[PDB]
Design a protein around this ligand. Structure first.
Ligand SMILES: [Cl-]
Ligand SMILES: [Cl-]
Lengths: 72, 104
């Protein structure tokens, strides 16, 4: 049911290969947590992840949505 | 900074003056644990809920330290030491070699 190990793994993987890049990885991490939220209601590691992503996104001043490509 | 992992450590018994009581081996690969413990810890199955909570508390209060990189699995070694009448005695020594490191 709870798929937080896969979110943790993907984020650790993304940060091993390298602030613009970290914010992307943090947004993917946030998206991943949201997608398994329903199966992690009582999971401690899950709620720690959600706290850590927010803490890390406040640091490095990440945007929650990610930049759009501008017109040609 | 490099994250929590196992590092080489060969213990030479001559270098510590232990060759007088240790007949065999002349030394052994002991290893040691070292490295930073950053969020997320729960990407390892050898950490703990307390270490995960401490890391969360540390992020809100820097006075509370981060988890520490320590051995989470140790293995035994057999050694020969000298007994009475210079009798060579085989003995197993538990928790001598690092087999795994984790953030605790
Ligand atoms: Cl965590
Ligand atoms: Cl002993």
């Amino acid at each position: 049911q709870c798929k937080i190990l896969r979110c943790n793994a993907e984020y650790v993987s993304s940060t091993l290969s390298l602030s613009g890049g970290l914010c992307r990885a943090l947004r993917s991490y946030a998206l991943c947590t949201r997608r398994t939220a329903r199966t992690c209601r009582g999971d401690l590691a899950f709620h720690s992840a959600v706290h850590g992503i927010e803490d890390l996104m406040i640091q490095h001043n990440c945007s929650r949505q990610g930049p759009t490509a501008p017109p040609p | 900074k490099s994250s929590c992992k196992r590092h080489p450590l060969y213990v030479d018994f001559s270098d510590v003056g232990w060759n007088d009581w240790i007949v065999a081996p002349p030394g052994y690969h002991a290893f040691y644990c070292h490295g930073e413990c950053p969020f997320p810890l729960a990407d390892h199955l050898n950490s703990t809920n307390h270490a995960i909570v401490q890391t969360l508390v540390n992020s809100v209060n820097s006075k509370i330290p981060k988890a520490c990189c320590v051995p989470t699995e140790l293995s035994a070694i057999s050694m020969l030491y000298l007994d009475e009448n210079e009798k060579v005695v085989l003995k197993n020594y538990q928790d001598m070699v690092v087999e795994g490191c984790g953030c605790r």
